Amino acid sequence: GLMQFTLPVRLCKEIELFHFDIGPFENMWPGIFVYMVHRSCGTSCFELEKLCRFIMSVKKNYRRVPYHNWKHAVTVAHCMYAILQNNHTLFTDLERKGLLIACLCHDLDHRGFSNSYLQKFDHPLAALYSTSTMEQHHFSQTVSILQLEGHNIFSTLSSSEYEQVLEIIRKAIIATDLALYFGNRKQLEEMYQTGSLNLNNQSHRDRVIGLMMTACDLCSVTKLWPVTKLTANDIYAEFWAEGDEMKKLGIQPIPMMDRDKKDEVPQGQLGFYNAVAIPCYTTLTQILPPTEPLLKACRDNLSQWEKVIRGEE
Ligand SMILES: CCCNC(=O)c1c(C(=O)OCC)cnn1C
Ligand SMILES: [Mg+2]
Ligand SMILES: [Zn+2]
């Protein structure tokens, strides 16, 4: 009850910043996650005992893949923590609870492969879920861990509060499906420029939360250059493994995933910053002006990728 989580001074200070890196000590990441929940939500909102058991079942159900791992889960929850703390009054007690758990859970049981590879492989998950294949699985794994004896961190919500939070978490996780991002940000762009955007309109909140999810999911592009640069290696380790599996099915992969075309990464990053990241943080900043640091950090890293092509590194 009177049990707080305290961090070392540098973590205590740096964690509040968008660009915070959770460091290489895995055994600290749970404490970091609880610290974020307690400051974002209250020391009340979850029974510590039940949270601590949920966090470890969640950790256990992430795999040892180069990028889509437990570290990704906590980095993505941290970025949601920075957004929610810089936009205090805009979000309800339940949204704050739901989104942090959504972000920790959003890639549960990822195998390091795209929705596309499953479809070409004809993986059984591509039969059970025709769109947002991994993402329907991720929410499905979430609900399974919530159903374990001593794991319902939501036990003390009213019945209708329970269905509201599992609905926030489902929309939140599904929205991390990048095929859905393009449409969602188009509709948010138009609604803010024709001025019809209304944060009291549930279908509008849904879209805004969805963009937040995309923004947190992508947030390795908003870190300091050396973090972003080293994360890019992990991301390409999964992409080239997938490309190798595409070749194994006798399909030529897109160049992004072809490890022979390692030369074109810097140009592939420019495409992704221009086509996805910058448009994402731009529209986010417009709706939530305190998220600007993410835009500024993204533009800086766009700049750094340009210097790699110009042969300046
Ligand atoms: C699979 C997740 C979607 N993409 C990314 O998260 C990403 C990329 C990328 O997609 O690059 C494509 C050439 C580059 N940096 N980051 C964070
Ligand atoms: Mg995902
Ligand atoms: Zn993710």
Residues 58 and 163 sit within 8 Å (Cβ to Cβ): no
> Can you say whether residue 94 is alpha, beta or left, with left for phi > 0 and alpha for psi between -120 and 50 degrees?
alpha
User: In whole angstroms, what separates CA 116 from the centre of its chain?
Assistant: 19
Rounded-to-integer distance, Cα 10 and Cα 20, Å? 10
227 lines ligand 1 (CB under 6 A): no
What is the spatial distance between Cα 14 and Cα 34, in angstroms, rounded to a whole number?
Answer: 16
**Which own/partner contact pairs does 230-237 have at CB distance under 8 Å and 24+ positions apart?**
231/67, 232/265, 232/269, 233/66, 234/66, 234/67, 235/66, 235/67, 236/262, 236/265, 237/66, 237/67
Distance between CA atoms of residues 39 and 52, nearest Å: 16
Check residue 43 and report its DSSP letter. S
Instruction: Determine how many CB atoms are found less than 10 A away from the CB of residue 186.
Output: 12
Find the catalytic residue in 19, 38, 68, 138. 68
Distance between CA atoms of 230 and 4, rounded to whole angstroms? 33
Residues 6+ apart with CB under 8 A from 255: 261, 264, 268
Q: What is each CA distance from 194 to 166, 191, 201, in whole angstroms?
A: 32, 5, 16
**Domain annotation for the chain: domains and CATH numbers:** 28-310 (1.10.1300.10)
Q: Is the CB of 192 under 6 A from ligand 1?
A: no
Which of 272, 308, 60 is closest to 181 using CA atoms? 272
DSSP symbols for 220-278: GGGS-HHHHHHHHHHHHHHHHHHHHHHHHTT-PPPGGG-GGGGGGHHHHHHHHIIIIIH
Q: How many CB atoms neighbour CB 91 within 10 A? A: 20
Can you list the alpha helix ranges (DSSP code H) found in the chain? 9-14, 29-41, 48-60, 70-85, 93-105, 115-121, 124-128, 133-146, 159-175, 178-193, 202-217, 225-248, 265-272, 278-287, 292-309
The experimental method is X-ray
**What 3-state class would DSSP assign to 311?**
coil
Q: How far apart are CA 288 and CA 216, in angstroms?
A: 14
DSSP designation for 219: G
Question: Closest Cα to residue 103, out of 133, 82, 73?
Answer: 73
Check pocket membership of 69 for ligand 1, CB cut-off 6 A: no
Q: How many CA atoms lie within 13 A of 152 on its CB side?
A: 11
Which atom of ligand 1 has the smallest separation from the CA of 271? 13
Provide the CA 250 distance to its chain's centre, in angstroms: 32
The radius of gyration computed from the CA coordinates of the chain, to the nearest angstrom, equals 19
Torsion of CA 8, 81, 32, 235, to 10 degrees: -110
- φ, ψ at 44 (rounded to 5°): -80, -50
Q: Ligand 1, closest atom to CA 238?
A: 1
CA distance linking residue 126 with residue 121, whole number of Å: 9
Sign of CA dihedral 285, 290, 293, 294: negative
Ligand 3 centroid to 292 CA: how many Å?
Answer: 21
Q: Answer whether 134's CB lies under 8 Å from 125's CB.
A: yes
How far apart CA 133 and CA 181 sit, in angstroms, is: 15
- Tell me the C-alpha distance between 109 and 97, whole Å: 22
Cβ atoms of 191 and 265 within 8 Å: the answer is no
* Cα→Cα distances 175→13, 73, 135, 193, Å: 30, 15, 8, 22
Token duo for residue 171: 């929309």
In the chain, after which residues does the backbone break, taking C–N over 2.5 angstroms as a break?
none
Per the CB < 8 A criterion, the answer to whether 134 and 118 are in contact is yes
Task: Specify the residue with its C-alpha closest to ligand 1, atom 5.
Answer: 218
DSSP 295: H
User: d(Cα 236, Cα 233) in Å, to the nearest integer?
Assistant: 5
Q: Could you tell me which residues come within 8 angstroms of residue 256 by beta carbon, excluding any fewer than 6 positions away?
A: 239, 268
- State this model's resolution in angstroms: 2.3
62's tokens: 């992430």
Two tokens at 189? 């762009």
Is-contact 297 19, C-beta < 8 A? yes
